[PDB]
Symmetry: D2
Subunit: 242 residues, 4 copies
């Protein structure tokens, strides 16, 4: 997270951290609990090449990374078949936990938006995670969960901005229909935040609008962060999670 | 260049090296002289973001990099408008030299192929360059030009090979129509070879069948090197090169 | 600390962490409370060149680094004058806290030995710290205070081992007289543990035998860890600590 | 070499490059030919631990490193028995080439000073080598041999300068009697240059005053380069070298 602040212990109960096995169980991406038994993440975090299930762990909300670890096993990794890279799209994936989670005031699911949600500029939206604080800048220890309120920019506008300073033809889409943009040069997502959520407060209720996906750097001029648009994959999500 | 060998001084008179301004004039991509005044290269070497002509220089066929440089200014950098990433394709570009090269026996153009040339499996082709001798293994000094013969593989088979060990849907194209595959786990192009030439001897003439573009690692199982298919872009090339 | 285990919360009440300001108050060396107002560390940790006092802070016994920091200012940095490098000797320094520690049952001073104390082989000695767990292997998060029981070795047997595989003359002393040896290829202190304590239980009492100084790598064959002999520098210490 | 410039081809016939075996015969230290069959160098380049002779190669004078190699095998490595670290002293060594060198104009020996030579405060002395052009800054390719003229600084004046801004006692010498100082904040030797010669022209004859050995950084305020005083080790050298 570039900008923002440490989340209060009371915010973002659905946030999780993905851990890969090695010298220690290192965090590599974020995610969200969208069902007692399913975590929503970004496909690039776990693909496109097939990974070893035994080398992965899910960690639920934690105010400080690694300090109160209760690693959970995963029985399935479901990656969207249309995925190869985040620029092409379909950067979305599911982790079915070996066991369901006992919900809490501190840890519970996040609501997926209705299929018609669009999230126009102006909506209060926050992206959260334990990722870098700036290009090539690691989140220092104790690794507090960070949050930052980011502005949503219309797709067609964001697309045109990505073409700024590039050789790419104005009529060839960079920011696709299944993607969403948010952030400016002071507020953004960054490596390590990938797979986590972008949530907006809609009608007195938090809705997960996107999944941290990619972008040209973090907080750079004319390069807002790109998120996998949740609405574009509800059909797919629902094939697996109740 | 993975495997293969240092190239005889009389072979590959069209090879060029692209240099960026810095502590010194560092090699960052290969190229190929296709007209006394034009260099063919890979778009990802100079894009998708536009860079400053002043930071770029072109070095003609040299046996040992940096050994006896004779840098040449560039007047125009022309990138195919359909380019954004190598996985998406259209990874091709043209560099206009401020001045037309005096062709000799040691340095001259390579022939472009006719739109019909498919270059099927079994054709003798060589990739040349000064890139890494293996994944994360730099070409050691005195940095000699390397060559390695590579077996070509039909697009459809190469594409399916790339699905082996991957979550990508079998019906989702990974290797595209504007690309060409060649190489194995012991002979391949690699980082730093990008933008250079893949030439096949066709009925008496060396023709440039491809532009080194990308792949998953170098000489990795089921991951041959991917090249931009020169025939596909012949129309685009001729719109600028006489 | 190489080998050993995370230390229970009750043991090592004297352990302290030294911190330098940067993105965060990063730990860089060990240290030990020898008086409510004085911390004993290694000269190499804070020397030989003069450093800005506003750049240093001290942390008393903390189970996991960074977790619950209570950073303490420092008034004075006293380095043995005969110190230049650890191989030469006199790797010992004193830190004067801005004010006395409210000594408690959990965090309190360690006892310095008598000048006559020798701490001979087969003795029960221990080293504690937050340093690397192996050569080029940082203590993983959440960084718990580690401890390891190490076997003391006579200074001359140690010097002999250090000459094995080296050009240095047999008659030339590597392990000097103001130094002490402990450890093997399975247990040893390492970078990050410098300045920390080596304590030995003598007739029902814990006595600080040395301060982590140097060695060739950590837990390497024929290369026991080398400590600054505290008995050697008592007059200097007493000259400052009441 | 910090500051200075490339050496004309005619100068420094005695300079040599020491190579270690790896992906390629990598340069690691400089050296000087003092006998058709003997090379003078620093002991820290090849010690304190004993090295594998099959892994070492010597390269006589080269305008450009690696471009026209002709590696010569070594039959013996003589490290001064008093050596352990460069701050302690005796940073000198001898390599005996397997075969006597065919001496000429382009490449021949350097003259060692008489037992009493002194080299007074501020003399035209030169240091040469293929090392870093600055702290953490490498010699870019094609790695031309650099030269730079450096002022001598009497040892007492130098030692005092090393004490400025340092804790070490004024009566404890850092710059030792078997050492010599040269250089300033704009001209100096650096990592990679170690083992190479420092020559001072006295009465038409170029004499080697020292061996590049150590210092605090390169060309740092109040920290001139430190060299092993040749005159101090003449007897030891002649015990081996005719
Ligand atoms: N702030 C949003 C965000 C969130 C999480 C991770 C990233 C990271 C994605 C990878 N990345 C690239 O710049 C990047 C990597 N690969 C491809 C591209 C697009 C093409 C490109 C390449 C080079 C220059 C310009 C444009 C961009 C760093 C930020 C970005
Ligand atoms: N052997 C031919 C060749 C020639 C020149 C350069 C490369 C390099 C391209 C970048 N590269 C990647 O692995 C790579 C980088 N970005 C994206 C992908 C595709 C998606 C992917 C990512 C991670 C794992 C599997 C697949 C692959 C290293 C080799 C390869
Ligand atoms: N396991 C004991 C221990 C405890 C704390 C810190 C260290 C570190 C000191 C620095 N270090 C060196 O190898 C080292 C650094 N500088 C100098 C020397 C002595 C000379 C030398 C150099 C190279 C090889 C052999 C001998 C050794 C790593 C371990 C070691
Ligand atoms: N310009 C002279 C010269 C020539 C060749 C190589 C070096 C290198 C020696 C190692 N080095 C150190 O800074 C260095 C390494 N270890 C020990 C010391 C002395 C003690 C010291 C350490 C840190 C700060 C101040 C003083 C200094 C880099 C330059 C320096």
């Amino acid at each position: 997270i570039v900008g923002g602040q440490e989340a209060p212990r009371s915010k973002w109960p659905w946030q999780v951290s993905l851990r890969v096995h090695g010298p220690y169980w290192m965090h590599f991406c974020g995610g969200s609990l969208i069902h007692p038994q399913w975590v929503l993440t970004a496909a690039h975090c776990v693909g496109p090449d097939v990974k070893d299930l035994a080398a992965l762990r899910v960690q639920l909300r934690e105010q400080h990374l690694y300090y109160q670890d209760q690693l959970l096993p995963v029985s399935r990794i479901i990656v969207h078949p249309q995925f190869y890279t985040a620029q092409i799209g379909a950067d979305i994936a599911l982790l079915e936990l070996e066991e369901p989670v006992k919900v809490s005031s501190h840890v519970h699911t996040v609501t997926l938006p209705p299929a018609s949600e669009t999230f126009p500029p102006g909506m209060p939206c926050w992206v959260t995670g334990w990722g870098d604080v700036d290009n090539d800048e690691r989140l220092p220890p104790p690794f507090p969960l960070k949050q930052v309120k980011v502005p949503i920019m219309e797709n067609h506008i964001c697309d045109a901005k990505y073409h700024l300073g590039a050789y790419t033809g104005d009529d060839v889409r960079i920011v696709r229909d299944d993607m969403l943009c948010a952030g400016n040069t002071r507020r953004d997502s960054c490596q390590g935040d990938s797979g986590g959520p972008l949530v907006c407060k809609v009608n007195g209720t938090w809705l997960q609008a996107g999944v941290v996906s990619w972008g040209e750097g973090c907080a750079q001029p004319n390069r807002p962060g790109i998120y996998t648009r949740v609405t574009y994959y509800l059909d797919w999500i629902h094939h697996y999670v109740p």
